[PDB]
Design a protein around this ligand. Structure first.
Ligand SMILES: *[C@@H](C)[C@H]1/C(=C/c2[nH]c(/C=C3N=C(/C=C4\NC(=O)C(CC)=C4C)C(C)=C\3CCC(=O)O)c(CCC(=O)O)c2C)NC(=O)[C@@H]1C
Ligand SMILES: *[C@@H](C)[C@H]1/C(=C/c2[nH]c(/C=C3N=C(/C=C4\NC(=O)C(CC)=C4C)C(C)=C\3CCC(=O)O)c(CCC(=O)O)c2C)NC(=O)[C@@H]1C
Ligand SMILES: *[C@@H](C)[C@H]1/C(=C/c2[nH]c(/C=C3N=C(/C=C4\NC(=O)C(CC)=C4C)C(C)=C\3CCC(=O)O)c(CCC(=O)O)c2C)NC(=O)[C@@H]1C
Ligand SMILES: *[C@H](C)[C@H]1/C(=C/c2[nH]c(/C=C3N=C(/C=C4\NC(=O)C(CC)=C4C)C(C)=C\3CCC(=O)O)c(CCC(=O)O)c2C)NC(=O)[C@@H]1C
Ligand SMILES: *[C@H](C)[C@H]1/C(=C/c2[nH]c(/C=C3N=C(/C=C4\NC(=O)C(CC)=C4C)C(C)=C\3CCC(=O)O)c(CCC(=O)O)c2C)NC(=O)[C@@H]1C
Ligand SMILES: *[C@H](C)[C@H]1/C(=C/c2[nH]c(/C=C3N=C(/C=C4\NC(=O)C(CC)=C4C)C(C)=C\3CCC(=O)O)c(CCC(=O)O)c2C)NC(=O)[C@@H]1C
Ligand SMILES: *[C@H](C)[C@H]1/C(=C/c2[nH]c(/C=C3N=C(/C=C4\NC(=O)C(CC)=C4C)C(C)=C\3CCC(=O)O)c(CCC(=O)O)c2C)NC(=O)[C@@H]1C
Ligand SMILES: *[C@H](C)[C@H]1/C(=C/c2[nH]c(/C=C3N=C(/C=C4\NC(=O)C(CC)=C4C)C(C)=C\3CCC(=O)O)c(CCC(=O)O)c2C)NC(=O)[C@@H]1C
Ligand SMILES: *[C@H](C)[C@H]1/C(=C/c2[nH]c(/C=C3N=C(/C=C4\NC(=O)C(CC)=C4C)C(C)=C\3CCC(=O)O)c(CCC(=O)O)c2C)NC(=O)[C@@H]1C
Ligand SMILES: *[C@H](C)[C@H]1/C(=C/c2[nH]c(/C=C3N=C(/C=C4\NC(=O)C(CC)=C4C)C(C)=C\3CCC(=O)O)c(CCC(=O)O)c2C)NC(=O)[C@@H]1C
Lengths: 160, 49, 169, 36, 160, 67, 161, 161, 161, 161, 161, 161
């Protein structure tokens, strides 16, 4: 969280957290309520969001389900949907934490070679993340969606 | 513009490698004459050249 | 580095002056435009990689020889190096737009570019041309977006062009 | 013995193609074609 | 500046600005109005603040102004007041910037060595800054006093 | 000069991001007393674990004749 | 480290599920206590040196340890003890601000116990000094945050022992 | 400066000795090579501007160096580049005639890299142009005279690099 | 660094075409000379200390360079000169086996002039020493490989000049 | 020196293309500001000496700088300081007209720092004098023109920093 | 380290004896199998990523370790594990080319077991991954090369155990 | 570095002559002055901070440098100035002990002028400060040792100029 980032910076400088860092921590503590609200809304509306995202992505990419793709088996299609669920869970974790650290340490660092080892196309997965973010933004309110969007955008950045 | 220059000295990044370049680079880095290993590399590659 | 607030603070500290009315006005202007700066930064963060790809996919048609033999993007290695440089430019433009100051643009981009690019034989004209193409794409995207203020976006790319370009006249 | 004469021998001259206009001057090439 | 710190943290990882750092930047820009109100109060009250703090210091620690003290004499007293003015100006810079980096860079790096060279009691200087904090916090609302107290306390800690 | 024989494991936190060759993170080495504090701080801040420490050199509680 | 806020996320990721009411209540409690934690952290940062000096005076000064033949007799060892106490105070402050003692477990109880045993540091004297730190900081910050900080200080003492 | 004769004479002088057998041998070798050197110098003098012309044509024409924004774009910049190549050709010819590379250091290389660094000029591109100059000279000069001219041009390239 | 193979391929690619008519001529010549050059390199590597011994005996020993006040006076400077002679022989071998002196440029001539001028090494004495090294190697390896190594030795000598 | 117009044309020509709409936008903005720029320039030109008189009276006169032992003490040094203030005002006018500080970088801030360092010129005193010049000019020319001139005056000051 | 030839030489040397018939025929066998070892190593290096990919697919894909809670769940942990498997494959290839297994203990088995214990890595799952690598490499290279590779792979697994 | 003894030894060695009476007289003079040098070194080491403090107060304080816009304005920059003076005093004491200004030339002056020219540090003002240090040290140590220290202080000043 932002608390972790501030305390890590203070430890690195061998000093206590500064005034600006303390005020940022205070602001994050204040906005924790909307962070929580992000949490319940995403958690309880994942299923429609994930279904719409998967259908849109596979319509745009008629290869993985098609011959010569990656998700022939139901075990593979369920795996792609599981990856959506895990990504959106990580996004909720990161929004609740306030920064990108949970996403970074759970499903961001090394994910490119993660899916190279499995032959899942990184551009395909980044397109999937784009459609998932679009679905989440459409399903969330305007200010709520604006707050949630940067984390999905950063995930897209790190993916490609 | 910038108010100081470090000095634009030439740079020679290796575009790709060849066997003689690899052997000579190993010898040069290790501060040695081309020992039996590099010499055999060079000999075999020259024969198959 | 130094954002606009830091550079104004340094300027007034130089003469040992308290923050006067003009200083307060400039600070207020930056603080009011901070919302638009953050919005543009969010937009460019969302569309960074695609913008750079489009910039290259127009720049190499403007200068076809940069992908032909003896051009400095010929290999896939060279092509990825060119893309990395353009992504560097976009990232530092984002940083400069949020900072409202080109000091970061000078400290971490321009202070050795001609040295490095001449050492590697990399042209310094197509580089700025691609930077300006990136700026045009960014401006068009921001204008399409609901950004009330977007004039500040042209500042970092223009400073890049001015500092990294050759003094033709 | 004389087979080692790589550098000391007469150098093998190479061929350097004279530089020519490229696709960056396609507009001018088409202008020349129509000015034909 | 908080903008400086966030941009530097982003560049140290080579990524674009993270959502958390953008949140911090937005909070800083929103609070900029209160920052300027506090800073303008400080600059308008610079004469009164410095005068009252100097009077309090010269009363609490008469040793520094007594003969044989560093501040003894008209010129030495004027220079002590000028240093108080310098630190008040640095406090204003930190208030405007939302952090203590300008105070650190201008008047808190090597201050111990400089005052050792000049023969000044660093604890006395810290006491002067603390009195400046009290006088200034007496001239503003509760929240603004707490806001300026962070910069004042940072100077106190760096001096003692 | 006092020596701290320290056994510790300090896994890297950036290998998969920097593409650097793997190294034997575990080590049981002797550290000088003066550098021991900074080394412990660095190991703990790198996420490492200090399995063991011993005073290999230098009588405990000695006041003079350190180095 | 491992924040109190990130603790619930880490647990939810370990069980492969989402934050629920049973942990979201703890999250809300942390959010409510955040302002008090930040206030205590600011106070402790302001009064870092004074707290250490007061605890040193109240616990170790004018004792067998500070007298000749004690482990805190020489000037270098006294300075080392002061530095250690300052680090204890700063890391207790970090634990207070983060709502957990995970950073104390990681960056404090990593090799400190065996290092002290090798150096012959008095464990009981260290515990007494930490108790003095806890009492002084509780007095300076208030009972409400004093108890919360003393929880992490007790964690440090128990880890040392 | 110093030709080969001057170099041998200076070595003998600094040692305070008469021209011994080895000095006579070196002088005889230079005298053996002299007529070919004169022939190559006359050829290059006849074809001075041409050689630079085809050198730039094989190297820098229709390129990023001569595009707008490059360092050779403007007419004045192109003239400056041509002037640099003219100096390089003339001084390589002088060095070939003298049998020594000391003239290059005395005149060209003593500050030229700092000059191009302050000018922003691309050392890689100028080295490419000089390298092309090597073959353009070799074609008109022959094989062994070409080797000598290439040696002096390689000295120029090493000085610039 | 680079070799003849990479130089040929670089020329071919920059021209944009395959290895048509003369790239393969140079490549076949290089491969033909490869075995003899490898044997010469092995002989030089075996005789490295010896070759330096006869070279120093011929050129530097019993001279003002070795006498007091000379740059090869003290034991450390003698060892440094011998190590430099080994450097010259090694990089001559590298250039011979790679078919190009670009290794000499990047690794030998990059800062040779700077280091030698800053230190005070006699350029003429070093050139004479390298000439003696070349002659000894040519005698010990044959006129053919002697000349083949001597081209790179003379490149180093010209760079020194 | 580069004004706004030459700056736009330079940015265009290093791209090789004609002035598009944005270039004309910048040019129209500069021409719009041109009338205010010219009015300020004419007023400053008429009130050249008076502004320097007021600035010297405000900052340097009756100070240690102008008393004995100060660098503005001797009559020749007083005249030199006045001429320097005239330089600052005139080049500020040039930068105002051109919409850029390129002339300041080329001529005013070109070696100025170590020039004053070698001569012994008090940097802080000259910066305060330039600030007084800026204040007087702003008072005499108007809020907007005063701020616009003060931008270049502050550029000179920060460069002197 | 050592190889087959080095090991037989050391075995003779410990008794200080010349190469007897047993050493002779062991060297004969190693020389005969060297071509097979080179072929298998070349194949493994050419397809190196595929072996690790298939081994993980048939070993830990859709598995408990990949499940959250295990040591294989996160993307970072998965990348670390695949890197470990790739290095184990490379060291097995080094051992097979060498003909001697001492290299594994030299570079790998020094502290991997205890470091995995410290990190809480499942040694049983590690051994299973090693075994799956065994079948993948055996299938890809051939039974003759498969057994030879599996000898060192089993050495690695036993050392980790 | 070099003291008087090593200086005379090297002077004899470079020409290869043994130590004669004329050389030995210099070492006798150095041995005569050694006691005074050691006394002065002890005094200066005792009063290192005080000397720099007094020199700074007597030369730099309340001048243009310390005021805003000067090169001694920020606290860090003041501390750097104090550190530079500390270097000058300490290395002057080293040179006075060694009786030779070689450590000053090779560890205090070789590039210091370039560093000040880059940083904008006023060389004339730093020379004035070193003169103040010279006067203070002369008053503190006596006419003879004061003059000897001032010799090397003037050496540093001349090197800076
Ligand atoms: C008197 C004119 C000066 C002065 C002295 C002073 N000292 C203390 C307290 C302590 N002094 C020490 C120092 C040491 N103890 C050691 O074992 C050694 C190792 C060589 C040293 C140097 C210590 C540790 C203390 C604390 C008490 C203790 O030892 O337990 C005081 C009282 C401090 C107080 O307020 O308690 C005083 C007055 N102080 C001055 O101002 C004079 C310069
Ligand atoms: C008895 C001393 C042994 C011996 C001597 C010997 N030396 C040489 C040649 C040289 N000796 C030196 C040594 C030094 N020069 C220095 O400046 C220093 C430090 C003062 C030393 C140690 C040198 C440099 C030479 C090279 C010749 C020259 O001076 O120019 C020889 C001749 C070797 C030859 O073949 O030329 C000899 C015979 N020989 C023995 O067998 C004794 C054990
Ligand atoms: C005979 C060789 C001449 C001679 C030599 C001499 N050289 C040095 C010192 C150095 N020589 C080098 C050169 C190189 N080092 C490298 O790595 C390379 C490429 C591989 C080169 C060309 C260097 C770097 C030094 C200094 C550092 C070092 O120790 O290597 C000396 C010593 C000079 C001194 O007084 O310190 C000498 C004497 N001396 C002669 O008289 C011959 C003409
Ligand atoms: C599609 C079936 C075929 C194809 C078409 C194609 N290529 C590009 C663009 C590029 N192709 C390359 C090629 C190479 N890079 C290398 O290093 C080498 C040797 C290994 C080659 C052959 C590169 C560098 C590019 C990008 C630059 C460029 O324009 O050349 C395109 C254009 C894509 C776009 O417009 O964005 C197309 C349509 N390439 C194939 O390999 C297929 C046989
Ligand atoms: C007053 C609260 C204390 C005090 C003050 C005092 N200061 C001086 C002299 C100087 N003080 C400074 C400090 C600064 N200059 C800067 O530019 C800044 C950074 C922004 C600082 C902090 C300096 C440089 C001086 C030197 C004089 C000069 O301006 O050139 C004195 C006089 C010392 C003397 O005798 O010369 C005094 C008295 N004294 C106290 O006792 C108070 C604790
Ligand atoms: C994967 C095959 C199995 C697994 C392992 C696992 N290992 C780590 C972490 C590390 N592994 C190493 C590897 C080496 N250390 C050495 O000295 C060498 C010898 C050549 C090797 C190969 C290292 C160094 C680390 C630490 C990190 C670093 O690289 O610096 C982990 C990470 C655990 C974590 O969560 O942090 C894992 C999971 N675990 C399994 O379940 C697989 C069967
Ligand atoms: C003070 C309350 C007690 C005390 C202290 C004391 N400590 C040392 C020496 C060291 N202390 C540490 C401790 C740490 N290093 C870390 O990284 C952490 C995290 C904050 C801690 C707590 C270390 C590593 C040392 C070694 C010194 C070094 O620089 O590495 C001493 C000196 C011991 C000696 O001189 O032999 C002392 C005296 N002493 C007491 O009596 C108190 C109970
Ligand atoms: C046309 C009216 C006449 C003509 C033209 C001609 N020019 C070239 C080649 C070049 N022309 C230039 C000129 C400029 N480059 C600049 O940047 C500027 C200012 C913007 C000028 C004036 C240059 C530099 C070249 C070199 C080619 C290159 O850039 O690569 C040619 C062809 C030369 C060749 O060898 O191919 C021609 C034919 N020729 C006529 O007869 C007309 C009267
Ligand atoms: C009196 C006979 C005439 C006169 C005098 C007058 N002068 C000033 C102000 C200044 N005069 C000087 C001159 C010098 N300074 C020097 O160091 C030397 C050379 C050694 C000279 C000649 C200076 C520098 C000033 C500036 C003020 C200052 O000293 O700080 C004034 C006051 C002007 C004002 O308005 O401030 C006057 C009146 N005036 C006459 O009418 C007499 C003919
Ligand atoms: C769906 C959007 C895309 C896709 C999916 C796909 N994934 C796999 C296999 C795996 N995916 C994961 C996922 C993760 N690993 C992590 O560390 C995290 C971050 C916390 C996640 C989300 C893993 C672990 C695997 C392998 C192990 C397992 O499945 O348990 C496959 C299988 C491919 C194959 O079997 O060959 C597929 C198909 N495929 C697409 O085309 C989409 C773009």
């Amino acid at each position: 969280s932002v608390v972790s980032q501030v305390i890590l910076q203070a430890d690195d400088q061998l000093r206590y957290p500064t005034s600006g860092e303390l005020k940022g921590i205070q602001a994050f503590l204040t906005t924790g309520a909307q962070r929580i609200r992000i949490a319940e809304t995403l958690a309880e509306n994942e299923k429609k969001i994930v279904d719409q995202a998967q259908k849109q992505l596979f319509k745009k990419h008629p290869e993985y389900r098609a011959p010569g793709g990656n998700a022939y088996g139901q075990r593979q299609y369920n795996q792609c949907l599981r990856d959506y669920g895990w990504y959106l869970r990580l996004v909720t974790y990161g929004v609740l934490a306030g920064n990108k650290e949970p996403i970074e340490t759970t499903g961001l660092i090394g994910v490119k070679e993660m899916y190279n080892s499995l032959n899942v196309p990184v551009p395909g997965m980044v397109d999937a993340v784009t459609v998932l973010k679009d679905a989440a933004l459409g399903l969330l309110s305007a200010e709520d969606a604006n707050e949630t969007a940067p984390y999905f955008d950063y995930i897209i950045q790190f993916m490609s | 513009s910038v108010k100081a220059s470090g000095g634009s000295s030439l740079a020679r990044p290796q575009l790709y490698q060849t066997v003689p370049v690899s052997a000579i680079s190993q010898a040069e880095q290790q501060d040695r004459f081309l020992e039996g290993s590099e010499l055999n590399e060079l000999t075999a590659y020259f024969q198959s050249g | 580095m130094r954002d606009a607030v830091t550079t104004l603070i340094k300027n007034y500290d130089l003469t040992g002056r308290y923050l006067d009315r003009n200083a307060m006005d400039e600070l207020k202007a930056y603080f009011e435009s901070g919302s638009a700066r953050i919005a543009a930064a969010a937009m460019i963060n969302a569309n960074s990689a695609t913008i750079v790809k489009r910039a290259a996919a127009q720049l190499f048609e403007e200068i076809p020889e940069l992908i032909r033999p003896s051009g400095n993007a010929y290999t896939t290695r060279r092509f990825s190096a060119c893309l990395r440089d353009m992504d560097y430019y976009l990232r530092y433009a984002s940083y400069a737009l949020i900072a409202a100051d080109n000091n970061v643009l000078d400290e971490r981009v321009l202070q050795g570019l001609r040295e490095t690019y001449n050492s590697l034989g990399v042209p310094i004209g197509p580089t700025v041309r691609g930077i300006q193409i990136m700026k045009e794409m960014i401006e068009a995207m921001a204008e399409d977006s609901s950004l009330n203020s977007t004039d500040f976006i042209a500042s970092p790319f223009d400073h890049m062009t001015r500092e990294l370009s050759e003094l033709s006249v | 013995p004389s087979q080692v004469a790589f550098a000391s021998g007469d150098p093998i001259p190479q061929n350097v193609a004279r530089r020519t206009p490229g696709p960056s001057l396609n507009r001018f090439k088409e202008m020349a074609r129509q000015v034909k | 500046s908080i903008v400086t710190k966030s941009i530097v943290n982003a560049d140290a990882e080579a990524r674009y600005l993270s959502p958390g750092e953008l949140d911090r930047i937005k909070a800083f820009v929103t609070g900029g109005a209160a920052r300027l109100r506090i800073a303008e109060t400080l600059t308008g009250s610079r004469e009164t603040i410095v005068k009252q703090a100097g009077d309090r210091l010269f009363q609490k620690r008469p040793d520094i102004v007594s003969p044989g003290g560093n501040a003894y004499g008209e010129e030495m007293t004027a220079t002590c007041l000028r240093d108080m003015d310098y630190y008040l100006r640095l406090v204003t810079y930190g208030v405007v910037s939302g952090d203590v980096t300008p105070i650190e860079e201008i008047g808190l790096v090597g201050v111990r060595e400089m005052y050792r060279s000049l023969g000044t009691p660093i604890e006395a200087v810290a006491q002067s800054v603390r009195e400046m904090k009290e006088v200034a916090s007496g001239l503003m609302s509760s929240d603004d006093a707490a806001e300026a107290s962070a910069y004042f306390d940072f100077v106190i800690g760096k001096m003692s | 000069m006092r020596m701290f024989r320290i056994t510790a494991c300090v896994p890297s936190q950036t290998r998969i991001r920097t593409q650097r060759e793997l190294q034997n993170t575990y080590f049981t080495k002797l550290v000088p007393y003066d550098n021991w504090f900074r080394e412990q701080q660095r190991i703990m801040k790198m996420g490492g674990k200090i399995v063991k420490v011993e005073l290999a050199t230098g009588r405990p509680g000695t006041n003079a004749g350190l180095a | 480290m491992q924040d109190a806020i990130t603790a619930v996320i880490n647990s939810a990721d370990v069980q492969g599920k989402y934050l629920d009411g049973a942990a979201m209540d703890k999250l809300k409690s942390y959010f409510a206590s955040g302002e008090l934690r930040v206030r205590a952290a600011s106070v402790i940062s302001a009064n870092a040196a004074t707290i250490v000096k007061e605890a040193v005076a109240k616990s170790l000064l004018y004792s067998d340890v500070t007298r000749p033949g004690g482990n805190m007799y020489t000037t270098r060892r006294y300075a080392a003890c002061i530095r250690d106490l300052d680090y204890y105070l700063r890391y207790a402050t970090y634990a207070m601000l983060a709502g957990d003692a995970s950073i104390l477990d990681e960056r404090v109880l990593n090799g400190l116990k065996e290092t002290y045993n090798s150096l012959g540091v008095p464990i009981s004297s260290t515990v007494q000094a930490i108790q003095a730190i806890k009492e002084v900081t509780a007095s300076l910050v208030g009972a409400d945050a004093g108890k919360e900080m003393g929880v992490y200080l007790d964690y440090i003492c128990s880890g040392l022992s």
